[PDB]
Amino acid sequence: ATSTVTGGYAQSDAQGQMNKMGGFNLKYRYEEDNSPLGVIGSFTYTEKSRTASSGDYNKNQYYGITAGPAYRINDWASIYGVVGVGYGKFQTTEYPTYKNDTSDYGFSYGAGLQFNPMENVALDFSYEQSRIRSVDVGTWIAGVGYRF
Numbered sequence: 685a686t687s688t689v690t691g692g693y694a695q696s697d698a699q700g701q702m703n704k705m706g707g708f709n710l711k712y713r714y715e716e717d718n719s720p721l722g723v724i725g726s727f728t729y730t731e732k733s734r735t736a737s738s739g740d741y742n743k744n745q746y747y748g749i750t751a752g753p754a755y756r757i758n759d760w761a762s763i764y765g766v767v768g769v770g771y772g773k774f775q776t777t778e779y780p781t782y783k784n785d786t787s788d789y790g791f792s793y794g795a796g797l798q799f800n801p802m803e804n805v806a807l808d809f810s811y812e813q814s815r816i817r818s819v820d821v822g823t824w825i826a827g828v829g830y831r832f
Contacts, residue, residue, distance in 0.1 A: 685715045688722070688801060690808040690827030696730050696746055696770075698821040705742060707731035711808055711827045722754040724766060724796040726810045728823060739778030746772035748823065750792045750812050766796035770814045770821060790814025790821060801831040 750768025
């Protein structure tokens with residue numbers, strides 16, 4: 685078997701891709717004892733706030749669980765479709781309105797991409813998109829790290 689040890693930074697941004705909201709990442713899955721079959725785990729954690737001069741004071745955190753396998757077509761690369769849900773319950777934490785009416789989910793989906801590994805280097809990507817009504821969310825995650 686193998687364990688592809690990856691992690692890195694992510695930007696979950698919504699309503700207009702402009703927001704550094706990430707924290708850390710770790711991806712860690714097991715590989716099969718016959719086929720070249722792996723599994724691919726996204727985990728996101730958002731713990732950034734964004735001042736400038738307006739008052740975007742990012743309350744709450746997101747939590748986002750997306751999953752799928754990874755398998756080769758013949759023997760070039762291993763990529764697959766991955767699917768999940770994203771839950772965040774934010775609030776405007778400046779203007780005299782506080783939490784308005786927040787609470788919804790979005791079914792995150794996209795593809796999970798995994799690169800040709802090394803003996804101490806891995807390169808893993810997820811790109812997940814969700815919608816809430818008429819606000820898109822996009823989240824990319826870098827999985828850089830090792831493999832053994």
